[PDB]
Curated annotation (Swiss-Prot):
Note: Lysozyme C is capable of both hydrolysis and transglycosylation; it also shows a slight esterase activity. It acts rapidly on both peptide-substituted and unsubstituted peptidoglycan, and slowly on chitin oligosaccharides.
Organism per entry: Gallus gallus
Quaternary structure annotation from Swiss-Prot or TrEMBL: Monomer.
Protein name, entry field: Lysozyme C
Biological process according to GO: cell wall macromolecule catabolic process; defense response to bacterium; defense response to Gram-negative bacterium; defense response to Gram-positive bacterium; killing of cells of another organism
Main location: secreted
UniProt gene name: LYZ
Highest classification ranks of the organism: Eukaryota, Metazoa, Chordata, Craniata, Vertebrata
Compartment(s) of residence: Secreted
Record's keyword annotation contains DNA-binding: no
Keyword Signal assigned: yes
Disulfide bond residue pairs: C6-C127, C30-C115, C64-C80, C76-C94
Reactions catalysed, as given in the entry: Hydrolysis of (1->4)-beta-linkages between N-acetylmuramic acid and N-acetyl-D-glucosamine residues in a peptidoglycan and between N-acetyl-D-glucosamine residues in chitodextrins
Family per record: Belongs to the glycosyl hydrolase 22 family.
Length: 129
């Protein structure tokens, strides 16, 4: 599913992402924009052989099992395919684990390069929330 901007903000809020670990909703929406362009089915293969999955491009080296990432872990205890659902529950639950890990949202490189320090509130402006 390709979410609308406000539609995803509402879904993220419903699922408890607003100010999770102190990161406002705009931060999460901005990270989703640049990671996946709001497309739950986004995938992208990395040079190391891992793959990024879903709206928040969660990676198979640590967080999910795809069966093809040697040496990897599955710390969210989910198949990576769960991260491609129209229902963002699995992505959210795993993202909360990730953002709790130490480096906050710096775990998402697109967030650190394109969202961090910006006026992220723009991403939820106008939305019925």
């Amino acid at each position: 599913k390709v979410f609308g901007r406000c539609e995803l903000a509402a879904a993220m809020k419903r699922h408890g992402l607003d100010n999770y670990r102190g990161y406002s909703l705009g931060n999460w929406v901005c990270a989703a924009k640049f990671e996946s362009n709001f497309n739950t089915q986004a995938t992208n293969r990395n040079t190391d052989g891992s793959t990024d999955y879903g709206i928040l491009q969660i990676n198979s080296r640590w967080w999910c099992n795809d069966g093809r990432t040697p040496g990897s872990r599955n710390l969210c205890n989910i198949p990576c395919s769960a991260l491609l659902s129209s229902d963002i529950t699995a992505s959210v639950n795993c993202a909360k684990k990730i953002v709790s890990d130490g480096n906050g949202m710096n775990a998402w490189v697109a967030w650190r390069n394109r969202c961090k320090g910006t006026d992220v509130q723009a991403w939820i402006r106008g939305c019925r929330l």
